[PDB]
Amino acid sequence: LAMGWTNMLYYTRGFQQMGIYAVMIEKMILRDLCRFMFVYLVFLFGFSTAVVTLIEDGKYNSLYSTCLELFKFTIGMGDLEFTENYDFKAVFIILLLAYVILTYILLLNMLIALMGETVNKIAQESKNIWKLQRAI
Amino acid sequence: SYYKGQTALHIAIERRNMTLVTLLVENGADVQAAANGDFFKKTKGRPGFYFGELPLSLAACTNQLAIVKFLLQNSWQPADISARDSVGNTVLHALVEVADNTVDNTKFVTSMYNEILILGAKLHPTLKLEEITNRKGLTPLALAASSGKIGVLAYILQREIHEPECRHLSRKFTEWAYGPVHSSLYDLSCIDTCEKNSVLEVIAYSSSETPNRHDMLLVEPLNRLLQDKWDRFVKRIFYFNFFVYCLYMIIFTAAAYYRPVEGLPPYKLKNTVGDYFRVTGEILSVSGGVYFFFRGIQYFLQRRPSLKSLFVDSYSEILFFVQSLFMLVSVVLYFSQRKEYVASMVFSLAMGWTNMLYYTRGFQQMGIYAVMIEKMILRDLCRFMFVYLVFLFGFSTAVVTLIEDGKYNSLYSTCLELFKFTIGMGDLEFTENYDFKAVFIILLLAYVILTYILLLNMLIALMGETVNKIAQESKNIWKLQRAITILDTEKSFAFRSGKLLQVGFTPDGKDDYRWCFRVDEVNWTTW
Amino acid sequence: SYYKGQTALHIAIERRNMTLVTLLVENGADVQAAANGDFFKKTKGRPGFYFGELPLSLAACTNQLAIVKFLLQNSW
Ligand SMILES: CCCCCCCC(=O)OC[C@H](COP(=O)(O)O[C@@H]1[C@H](O)[C@H](O)[C@@H](OP(=O)(O)O)[C@H](OP(=O)(O)O)[C@H]1O)OC(=O)CCCCCCC
Ligand code: NA
Structure with missing residues (x-):
């Protein structure tokens, strides 16, 4: 059902502006999201392993729970105090602050910048690809 | 004087x-x-002009072609061509010295270089000026590579000579031509392997002080050489190293995730398979840590940085060394019956997972992305962090002074509460222990408007500008990063190219071979 | 060969x-x-030049207009 509702976007061709928009989405997915996702997953996994190793026991002593907690920061819902089952508070805070500064403040904004560059670069190519999509 | x-x-x-x-x-x-x-010395004071300290060099370096012709063709006292000054530089060395990478200056320097070379061939066919090395132990080509003289290097690496009894001086040749396509040969003599100093290792290991270290490798033969060596063997060696590092990090993660958590190490060895595997994993991780520590030590000993490029170049090396230091401190604490070994090892684990990003080179797009990250961290995050920390500390002090008592009467608690705004989790009502609500609200609103709405968006804008400005520079830096990887892979322990014949006869009877590297190009005009 | x-x-x-x-x-x-x-083949090795494998094509593909005129206007 979800796949079908997303595939609804195929018929966006046949209308010039929406077709160009969809072609741009396709290019962005291919390049920028892929590179960003690789680097972001590396950082998230590394810091999640460090944090979960630090924790002694409790609800968040599993890799999945801590990975979800770390991911919540990306969507503007990070807690910074989601647990207290550790021996060293300074290490916990330093790890969390480093992860935040490295991903939330740096990588997301750089992704915005690179998206802007790509948008600047691929206008005529997007129009030509839309024309080819309509010819097919 | x-x-x-x-x-x-x-x-x-x-x-x-x-x-x-x-x-x-x-x-x-x-x-x-x-x-x-001293006026004729190199840099003894702002006034001065270095020209080699000889009349021949003075004529060569000041648009005096007739004068040098005369000095080399005078019967009363012919001018010597191999003369060396106090510094050890000859006429060609001085010509390299006076080059400053300007169109007219480069044109003149190359023209005089070629003319003097031809004249030296004519008067002294046996003598070869290109091998005369100054007191520093550098040939003129090595001097041009070290000094950053892009124009002189480009001219030298691909010069062609088409006059009688002096065609042997040329460095590029033409093996054969058929229709619009002809094959050219480049002389790799003293470019990739020289056993004392070569163009590639001189360029790659040059300190950041050198002007055009990034753009130097864009000269055709050097780029072709680097790509050829890569594709030949360095790609496979690099892939194997990347795979081994991934396995090591996985083993380290698995060992750390299953630490026994019982109190006051060291811990005993329970007679079970899992405990044996955990002990093996931690031994392997410690072995990797010591290996990286020794690698960093020998790197520092060999390169011997100037104590300032440490903070400007070799970021990867210092990061790997710091990871190893954390691991070693962790081991020492562990055997000393302390719990802080866990803190050290988690720091090391996070550092290693981030250092995984080093192997991003070897893939063009990801390498460019990593170079961009490095530039952004150096410039934009640093300036933003300074200003942001000033604002955050000031407003935190004001707020905590306002508060009378309670949980948030400490500087740390209020600083954390103020920081939560930056990540989209600010409360605006986190406390009520104050006498004046209007002052509290005004302070918080001012802090929000100043940081969240203004500085973050301006950071996005400046990041966009920088991204717009540093594309080709990022690609050049990636190319330099791959060239350094190739050279290090060779040195840790392939040859130049096929041996070939180009002239068939030097000025003497015997012939010569000069280890050429083939390139094929197609032309559709100027038949 | x-x-x-x-x-x-x-x-x-x-x-x-x-x-x-x-x-x-x-x-x-x-x-x-x-x-x-093989030198005259399409891509049998980096060295080579495809021109059609005939003198007429060789003249046509190498700025030889007078030569192709001659070859098409020779009595012998
Ligand atoms: C405070 C931290 C400082 C270290 C981080 C510094 C920020 C950062 O992103 O790391 C860079 C490092 C690559 O550095 P690497 O030394 O190998 O590459 C060189 C580096 O850029 C130097 O500035 C120059 O050295 P040199 O001229 O040839 O002699 C030259 O570039 P340029 O400047 O001349 O144009 C490059 O050759 O990448 C990682 O491996 C770590 C993964 C990133 C993880 C980042 C997490 C911190
Ligand atoms: Na939020």
Whole structure:
């Protein structure tokens, strides 16, 4: 059902502006999201392993729970105090602050910048690809 | 001492008067006097002009072609062509020195270089000026590579000569031509392997002080060489290293995730399979840590940075070394019956997972992305962090001074509460222990408007500008990063190219081979 | 096998010498020989140049208008 509702976007061709928009989405997915996702997953996994190793026991002593907690920061819902089952508070805070500064403040904004560059670069190519999509 | 050493020949050559030069040469004045005055020294004060300290070099470096012709074709006292000054530089060395990467300057320097080379071939066919090395132990090509003289290096690496008895001087050749396609040969003599210093290792290991270290490798033969070596063997070696590092990090993660958590290490060895595997994993991780520590030590000993490029170059090396230091401190704490070994090892684990990003080179797009990350961290995050920390500390102090008592009466708690706004989790009502609500709200609103709405968005804008500005520079830096990887892979322990014949006869009877590297190009005009 | 199939017509056309081309055509050398050498093949190795494997095509593909005029307007 979800796949079908997303595939609804195929018929966006046949209308010039929406077709160009969809072609741009396709290019962005291919390049920028892929590179960003690789680097972001590396950082998230590394810091999640460090944090979960630090924790002694409790609800968040599993890799999945801590990975979800770390991911919540990306969507503007990070807690910074989601647990207290550790021996060293300074290490916990330093790890969390480093992860935040490295991903939330740096990588997301750089992704915005690179998206802007790509948008600047691929206008005529997007129009030509839309024309080819309509010819097919 | 300042002007001392000058003779009338120097003044005559400077003023550019042929008649006076000839008349003065009639008397027989020596044409080998060296001007050692400080004005003629390299950089002894802002005033000065280095020209090699000889009349021949002075003529060569000041648009005096007729004068150098005369000095080399005068019967009374012919001018020596191999003469070396106090610094050890010859005429070609001085010509390289005076180059400054300007269109007219480069044109003249290359033209005089070629003319003097041809003249030296004519008068002294046996002598080869290109091998004369100054007191520093550098040939003119090595000097050009080290000094950052892009134009001279480009001219030298691909010069062609088409005159009788002096075609052997050329470095590029033409093996064969058929229709619009012809094959050219480049001389790899003393470019990739020289056993004392070569163009590639001189360029790659040059300190950041050198002007055009990034753009130097864009000269055709060097780029072709680097790509050829990569595709030949370095790609596979690099892939194997990347795979081994991934396995090591996985083993380290698995060992750390299953630590026994019982109190006051060291811990005993329970007779079970899992405990045996955990012990093996931690031994392997410690072995990797010591290996990286020793690698960093020998790197520092060999390169021997100037103690300032440490903070400007070799970021990867220092990061790997710091990871190893954390691991070693962790081991020492562990065997000393302390719990802080866990803190050290988690720091090391996070550092290693981030250092995983080093192997992003070897893939063009990801390498460019990583270079961009490095630039952004150096510039934009640093400036933003300074200003943001100032604002955050000031407003935190104001707020915590306002509060009377409670949980948030400490500087740390209020700083954390103020920081939560930056990540989209600010409360605006986190406390009520104050006398004035209006002051509290005004302070919080001012802090929000100043940071969240203004500085973050301006950071996005400046990041966009920087991204717009640093594309080609990022690609060049990635190319340099891959060249360094290739050279290090070779040095840790392949040859140049096929041996071939190009001239068939040197000025002497015997012939020569010069380890050429083939390139094929297609032309559709100028038949 | 590499250069095999070439005839003197191909060399004459390549060097762009009308006089030699005419003199060689006087003898009556066939103008339909096909050069099947690997150098003349499409992509059999980095060295090579595809031109169609005929003197007419070689003239057409190498700025030889007078030569193709001659080959198409020769009585012999
Ligand atoms: C405070 C931290 C400082 C270290 C981080 C510094 C920020 C950062 O992103 O790391 C860079 C490092 C690559 O550095 P690496 O030394 O190998 O590459 C060189 C580096 O860029 C130097 O500045 C120059 O050295 P040199 O001229 O040839 O002699 C030259 O570039 P340029 O400047 O001349 O144009 C490059 O050759 O990448 C990682 O491996 C770690 C993964 C990133 C993880 C980042 C997490 C911090
Ligand atoms: Na939020």
